[PDB]
């Protein structure tokens, strides 16, 4: 049954700048900020909203070499976006379910809170590399790299 992991980070960026890159402008940015993992991102169906499907192609050394994710929620007024891994990536490493929801809120003009909810499951005992204590660390690293990209 699906379990949850929650964490958060405060970033020294304006909410609207972080929202744009997180929710809309990430196609060219992901490979630039994660050049040690992500080669490119392809938008393959949809126009950026719910149902949009993305392929992340990873570096040649990486197995699986890609991950397919779908935007499963998108709310512009509450600044929430959710992405579910639907093929490859963690699903090829022992997970049966993996979704990441980001919600932004303004702390001050140049401080933005990002709440991160990870939902996941696995049918058997799993390796550390797919524990959400570990997967969340990768996600927080990406968020802090966006902050740096924007600064």
Closest CA to 67 of 50, 48, 87, 52: 87
Q: Does 56 bind ligand ZEA (CB under 6 A)?
A: yes
CB of 106 to ligand ZEA, least distance (A): 18
Q: Does 83 bind ligand ZEA (CB under 6 A)?
A: yes
- SS3 (DSSP) at 86: strand
Q: Which residues contact 113 (CB under 8 A, 6 or more apart)?
A: 8, 9, 10, 11, 104, 105, 106, 107
Structure-token pair, residue 40: 């490119």
Q: Does 142 bind ligand ZEA (CB under 6 A)?
A: yes
Q: Which is nearer to ligand ZEA, 12 or 65 (CB)?
A: 65
Contact footprint for ligand ZEA (CB under 6 A): 22, 26, 34, 37, 56, 58, 62, 67, 69, 83, 85, 89-90, 93, 100, 135, 138-139, 142
């Amino acid at each position: 049954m699906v379990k949850e992991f929650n964490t958060q980070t405060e970033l020294s960026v304006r909410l609207e700048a972080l929202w744009a890159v997180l929710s809309k402008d990430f196609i060219t940015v992901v490979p630039k900020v994660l050049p040690h993992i992500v080669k490119d991102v392809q938008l393959i169906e949809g126009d950026g909203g719910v149902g949009t499907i993305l392929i992340f192609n990873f570096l040649p050394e990486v197995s699986p070499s890609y991950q397919r994710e779908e935007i499963t929620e998108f709310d512009e007024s509450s600044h929430e976006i959710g992405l579910q891994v639907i093929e490859g990536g963690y699903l090829s490493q022992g997970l049966s379910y993996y979704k990441t929801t980001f919600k932004l809120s303004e702390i001050e003009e140049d401080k933005t809170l990002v709440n991160v909810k990870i939902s996941y499951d696995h049918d058997s005992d799993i390796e550390e590399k797919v524990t959400p204590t570990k997967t969340s660390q990768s996600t927080l690293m990406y968020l802090r790299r966006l902050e740096r990209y924007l600064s």
